[PDB]
Amino acid sequence: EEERSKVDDLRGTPMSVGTLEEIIDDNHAIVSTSVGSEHYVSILSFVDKDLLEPGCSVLLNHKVHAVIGVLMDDTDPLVTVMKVEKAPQETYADIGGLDNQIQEIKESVELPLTHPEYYEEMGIKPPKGVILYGPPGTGKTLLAKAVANQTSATFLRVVGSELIQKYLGDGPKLVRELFRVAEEHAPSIVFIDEIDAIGTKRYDSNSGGEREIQRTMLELLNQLDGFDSRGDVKVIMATNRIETLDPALIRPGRIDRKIEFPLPDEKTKKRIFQIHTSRMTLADDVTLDDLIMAKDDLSGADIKAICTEAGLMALRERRMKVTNEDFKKSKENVLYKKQEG
Amino acid sequence: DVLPPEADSSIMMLTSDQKPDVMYADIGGMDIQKQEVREAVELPLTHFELYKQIGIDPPRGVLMYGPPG
Amino acid sequence: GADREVQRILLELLNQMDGFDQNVNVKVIMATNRADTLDPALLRPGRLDRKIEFPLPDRRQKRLIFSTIT
Amino acid sequence: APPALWDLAADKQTLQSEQPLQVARCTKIINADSEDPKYIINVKQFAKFVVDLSDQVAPTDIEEGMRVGVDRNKYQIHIPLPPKIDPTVTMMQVEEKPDVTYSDVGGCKEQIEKLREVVETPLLHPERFVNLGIEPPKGVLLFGPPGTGKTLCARAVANRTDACFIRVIGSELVQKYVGEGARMVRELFEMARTKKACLIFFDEIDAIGGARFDDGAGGDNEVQRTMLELINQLDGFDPRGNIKVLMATNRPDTLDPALMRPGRLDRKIEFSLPDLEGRTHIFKIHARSMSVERDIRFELLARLCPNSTGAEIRSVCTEAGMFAIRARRKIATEKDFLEAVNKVIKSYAKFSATPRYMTYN
Amino acid sequence: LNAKVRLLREELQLLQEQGSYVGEVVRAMDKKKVLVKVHPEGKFVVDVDKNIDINDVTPNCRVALRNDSYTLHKILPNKVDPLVSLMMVEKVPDSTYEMIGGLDKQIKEIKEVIELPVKHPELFEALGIAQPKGVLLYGPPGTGKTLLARAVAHHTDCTFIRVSGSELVQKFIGEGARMVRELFVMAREHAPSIIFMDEIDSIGSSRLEGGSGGDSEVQRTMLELLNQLDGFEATKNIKVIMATNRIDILDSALLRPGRIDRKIEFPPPNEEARLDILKIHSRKMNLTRGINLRKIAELMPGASGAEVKGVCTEAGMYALRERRVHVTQEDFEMAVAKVMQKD
Ligand SMILES: Nc1ncnc2c1ncn2[C@@H]1O[C@H](COP(=O)(O)OP(=O)(O)OP(=O)(O)O)[C@@H](O)[C@H]1O
Ligand SMILES: Nc1ncnc2c1ncn2[C@@H]1O[C@H](COP(=O)(O)OP(=O)(O)O)[C@@H](O)[C@H]1O
Ligand SMILES: Nc1ncnc2c1ncn2[C@@H]1O[C@H](COP(=O)(O)OP(=O)(O)O)[C@@H](O)[C@H]1O
3-state SS record for D67-104: EEEECCCCCCEEEECCCCCCCHHHHHHECCCCCCCHHH
- Mutate which: E86, E90, E167, vs C, most C CBs within 10 A: E90
Q: Do E90 and C4 touch (CB under 8 A)?
A: no
Using CB atoms, which chains have 3+ pairs under 8 A with C?
A: B, E
Burial of A9 (0-12, 13-18, 19+ CB in 10 A): exposed
Mutate to test the pocket of ligand 3, among E143, E146, E277, E281 (most ligand atoms within 8 A of CB): E143
Q: How many CB atoms lie within 10 A of CB A201?
A: 14
- The DSSP letter of residue E205 is T
- Residue B31, chain C, CB below 8 Å: the answer is yes
Q: Which of D311, D324, D326 sits opposite A255 (nearest CB)?
A: D311
Question: What Å distances lie between residue E306 and E201, E288, E343, CA to CA?
Answer: 16, 22, 14
Q: Which of B25, B61, B65 sits opposite C31 (nearest CB)?
A: B65
Q: Do C54 and B66 touch (CB under 8 A)?
A: yes
Q: How many CB atoms lie within 10 A of CB E99?
A: 16
| Cis-peptide, bond into residue E140, ω within 30° of zero | no
Please tell me the distance from the alpha carbon of residue E124 to that of residue E142, in angstroms, as a whole number.
34
Enumerate the β-bridge partners of residue A18. A58
Q: Cβ(D207) to ligand 1 under 6 A?
A: no
CB E130 within 8 A of CB A304: yes
Output phi, psi for B66, to 5 deg: 110, 5
Q: Residue A80, by phi and psi: left (phi above 0), alpha (psi -120 to 50) or beta?
A: alpha
Across E55-118, the runs of DSSP E, i.e. the strands, are 61-65, 72-76
CB E184 within 8 A of CB E224: no
Please tell me the distance from the alpha carbon of residue D135 to that of residue D137, in angstroms, as a whole number.
6
Question: What Å distances lie between residue D91 and A50, D167, D277, D295, E278, CA to CA?
Answer: 15, 10, 42, 51, 70
CB D108 within 8 A of CB D272: yes
The residues lining ligand 3, judged by C-beta closer than 6 Å to any ligand atom, are E 100-102, 141-147, 243, 273, 277, 305-306, 308-309
Please tell me the distance from the alpha carbon of residue E269 to that of residue E103, in angstroms, as a whole number.
10
How many helices (DSSP H) and strands (DSSP E) are in chain E?
Answer: 14, 10
Q: Which residue of C has its CA nearest to E87?
A: C41
Output phi, psi for D40, to 5 deg: -85, 140
**Sign of the torsion formed by the C-alpha atoms of A20, A24, A26 and A31:** negative
| Cis-peptide, bond into residue E260, ω within 30° of zero | yes
Which residue from E16, E36, E20 is spatially nearest to E28, judged by alpha carbons?
E36
CB D287 within 8 A of CB D317: yes
Specify the pairing of strand E72-76 against strand E61-65. antiparallel
Q: Do B64 and C55 touch (CB under 8 A)?
A: no
CB A198 within 8 A of CB A241: no
CB D345 within 8 A of CB D308: yes
Which residue from D174, D289, D269 is spatially nearest to D220, judged by alpha carbons?
D174
D134's CB contacts (< 8 A; 6+ apart) are none
Ligand 1 centroid from CA D150, angstroms: 7
Ligand 3 centroid from CA E278, angstroms: 12
Contacts of E326 in chain B (CB under 8 A): 54
Q: Which residue of C has its CA nearest to E171?
A: C4
Buried b (16+ CB within 10 A) or exposed e, E78-93: eeeeebbebbbbbbbe
In chain C, residues preceding a discontinuity (C to N beyond 2.5 A) are none
| Cis-peptide, bond into residue E58, ω within 30° of zero | no
Q: Do C44 and E171 touch (CB under 8 A)?
A: no
Q: How many CB atoms lie within 10 A of CB E58?
A: 11
CB E318 within 8 A of CB E335: yes
Enumerate the β-bridge partners of residue D70. D77
* D29: Cα separation from own chain's centroid: 31
Please tell me the distance from the alpha carbon of residue D296 to that of residue E119, in angstroms, as a whole number.
69
Chain A from 217 to 276: CB within 8 A of any D CB: 218-219, 222-223, 225, 227-228, 242, 245, 247-248, 250-252, 255-256, 258
Which residue from A13, A50, A57, A14 is spatially nearest to A34, judged by alpha carbons?
A57
Ligand 3 centroid from CA E143, angstroms: 3
Specify the pairing of strand A130-131 against strand A15-23. unpaired
Helix, strand, coil share of chain E (percent; to 5): 45, 15, 45
Please tell me the distance from the alpha carbon of residue A159 to that of residue A194, in angstroms, as a whole number.
7
Please tell me the distance from the alpha carbon of residue D265 to that of residue D242, in angstroms, as a whole number.
12
On the CB side of C51, how many CA atoms lie within 13 Å of its CA?
9
Please tell me the distance from the alpha carbon of residue D187 to that of residue D193, in angstroms, as a whole number.
10
- DSSP three-state, residue E159: strand
Q: Which helix (H) or strand (E) holds D30?
A: strand D28-32
Torsion angle (degrees, nearest 10) of CA E219, E221, E227, E230: -80
Resolution of this entry, Å: 3.8
Please tell me the distance from the alpha carbon of residue D247 to that of residue E131, in angstroms, as a whole number.
55
CB E124 within 8 A of CB E117: yes
Q: Residue A48, by phi and psi: left (phi above 0), alpha (psi -120 to 50) or beta?
A: left
How many beta-carbon pairs under 8 angstroms link B with E? Answer: 32
Q: Do E320 and B55 touch (CB under 8 A)?
A: no
- HEC readout, chain B: CCCCCCCCCCCCCCCCCCCCCCCCCCCCCCCCHHHHHHHHHHHHHHCCHHHHHHCCCCCCECEEECCCC
Ligand 2 atom closest to A240 (CA): 23
Q: How many CB atoms lie within 10 A of CB A18?
A: 26
Torsion angle (degrees, nearest 10) of CA D182, D183, D188, D194: 130
- DSSP three-state, residue C40: helix
Query: Using only C-alpha atoms, what is the Rg of chain A?
Result: 27
Question: What Å distances lie between residue A92 and A96, A274, E22, CA to CA?
Answer: 8, 15, 54
Which residue from A122, A100, A102 is spatially nearest to D328, judged by alpha carbons?
A122
Q: How many CB atoms lie within 10 A of CB A228?
A: 16
Chain B from 50 to 69: CB within 8 A of any C CB: 59-67, 69
Closest-CA distance of chain B to residue C2, Å:
19
Which residue from D91, E253, E19 is spatially nearest to A336, judged by alpha carbons?
E253
End-to-end CA distance of chain B: 50
CB B62 within 8 A of CB C30: yes
Q: How many CB atoms lie within 10 A of CB E53?
A: 11
- The DSSP letter of residue E247 is S
CB E230 within 8 A of CB E239: no
- HEC readout, chain A: CHHHHHHHHHHCCCEEEEEEEEECCCCEEEEEECCCECCCCECCCCCCHHHHCCCCEEEEECCCCECCCECCCCCCHHHHCCCCCCCCCCCHHHCCCCHHHHHHHHHHHHCCCCCCHHHHHCCCCCCCCEECCCCCCCCCCCHHHHHHHCCCCCEEECCCCHHHHCCCCCCCHHHHHHHHHHHHCCCCEEECCCCCCCCCCCCCCCCCCHHHHHHHHHHHHHHHHCCCCCCCCEEEECCCCCCCCCHHHCCCCCCCCCCCCCCCCHHHHHHHHHHHHCCCEECCCCCCHHHHHHCCCCCHHHHHHHHHHHHHHHHHCCCCEECHHHHHHHHHHHHHHHHHC
Task: Give the residue, by CA position, lying nearest to ligand 3 atom 20.
Answer: E143
Ligand 1 centroid from CA A252, angstroms: 7
- The DSSP letter of residue D219 is S
Enumerate the β-bridge partners of residue E23. E63
Please tell me the distance from the alpha carbon of residue A39 to that of residue D71, in angstroms, as a whole number.
11
Ligand 2 atom closest to E223 (CA): 21
Question: What Å distances lie between residue D265 and D245, D249, E126, CA to CA?
Answer: 8, 15, 75
In this structure, chain A runs to a length of 341
Please tell me the distance from the alpha carbon of residue E323 to that of residue A165, in angstroms, as a whole number.
58
Enumerate the β-bridge partners of residue A189. A155, A234
Contacts of E168 in chain C (CB under 8 A): 4, 7-8, 11
- Residue E324, chain B, CB below 8 Å: the answer is yes
Ligand 1 centroid from CA D101, angstroms: 14
End-to-end CA distance of chain C: 50
**Sign of the torsion formed by the C-alpha atoms of D253, D259, D261 and D266:** positive
CA angle A303/A307/A311 to nearest 5° reads 165
Q: Cβ(D145) to ligand 1 under 6 A?
A: no
- Residue A297, chain D, CB below 8 Å: the answer is no
Closest-CA distance of chain A to residue D132, Å:
36
Specify the pairing of strand E159-162 against strand E134-138. unpaired
- The DSSP letter of residue E61 is E
Q: Which amino acid is at E138?
A: Y
| Cis-peptide, bond into residue A13, ω within 30° of zero | yes
- The DSSP letter of residue D66 is -
Which residue from A209, A180, A193 is spatially nearest to A149, judged by alpha carbons?
A193
Which residue from D234, D199, D197, D204 is spatially nearest to D142, judged by alpha carbons?
D204
Using CB atoms, which chains have 3+ pairs under 8 A with B?
A: C, E
Q: Residue A170, by phi and psi: left (phi above 0), alpha (psi -120 to 50) or beta?
A: left
Using CB atoms, which chains have 3+ pairs under 8 A with A?
A: D, E
Ligand 1 atom closest to A221 (CA): 27
Please tell me the distance from the alpha carbon of residue A56 to that of residue A29, in angstroms, as a whole number.
12
Which residue from E218, E55, E76, E194 is spatially nearest to E135, judged by alpha carbons?
E194
Q: Do E171 and C39 touch (CB under 8 A)?
A: no
Please tell me the distance from the alpha carbon of residue E236 to that of residue A22, in angstroms, as a whole number.
48
Torsion angle (degrees, nearest 10) of CA A86, A92, A93, A97: 150
CB D42 within 8 A of CB D18: no
- Residue E327, chain B, CB below 8 Å: the answer is yes
Question: What Å distances lie between residue A153 and A77, A114, A187, E230, CA to CA?
Answer: 22, 9, 7, 20
Name the packing angle between helices D221-235 and D180-194 (round to 10°): 20
Side-by-side strand order, sheet with E159-162: E159-162, E193-196, E238-241, E134-138, E262-265
| Solving technique | cryo-EM
Q: How many CB atoms lie within 10 A of CB C3?
A: 8
Torsion angle (degrees, nearest 10) of CA D172, D173, D176, D177: 130
Q: Cβ(D152) to ligand 1 under 6 A?
A: no
Torsion angle (degrees, nearest 10) of CA C5, C11, C12, C14: 150
**Sign of the torsion formed by the C-alpha atoms of A9, A10, A16 and A22:** negative
Please tell me the distance from the alpha carbon of residue E3 to that of residue E1, in angstroms, as a whole number.
5
Burial of E33 (0-12, 13-18, 19+ CB in 10 A): buried
Please tell me the distance from the alpha carbon of residue E144 to that of residue D191, in angstroms, as a whole number.
64
Q: Which residue of E has its CA nearest to B43?
A: E321
Q: How many CB atoms lie within 10 A of CB D304?
A: 13
Please tell me the distance from the alpha carbon of residue A224 to that of residue A212, in angstroms, as a whole number.
18
Give the number of the ligand closest to the Cα of residue A269: 2
CB A110 within 8 A of CB A151: no
D314's CB contacts (< 8 A; 6+ apart) are A255, D282, D286
Ligand 1 centroid from CA A109, angstroms: 23
Please tell me the distance from the alpha carbon of residue A314 to that of residue A325, in angstroms, as a whole number.
11
Please tell me the distance from the alpha carbon of residue E202 to that of residue E141, in angstroms, as a whole number.
10
Please tell me the distance from the alpha carbon of residue A56 to that of residue A20, in angstroms, as a whole number.
6
Output phi, psi for E127, to 5 deg: -90, -15
CB D110 within 8 A of CB D208: no
Ligand 1 atom closest to D310 (CA): 8
Specify the pairing of strand D199-203 against strand D247-248. parallel
Enumerate the β-bridge partners of residue E241. E135, E196
**Sign of the torsion formed by the C-alpha atoms of D216, D220, D225 and D231:** negative
Ligand 1 centroid from CA A234, angstroms: 19
Task: Give the residue, by CA position, lying nearest to ligand 3 atom 11.
Answer: E306
A269's CB contacts (< 8 A; 6+ apart) are A292, A295, A298, A303
Please tell me the distance from the alpha carbon of residue D9 to that of residue E240, in angstroms, as a whole number.
59
CB E84 within 8 A of CB E161: yes
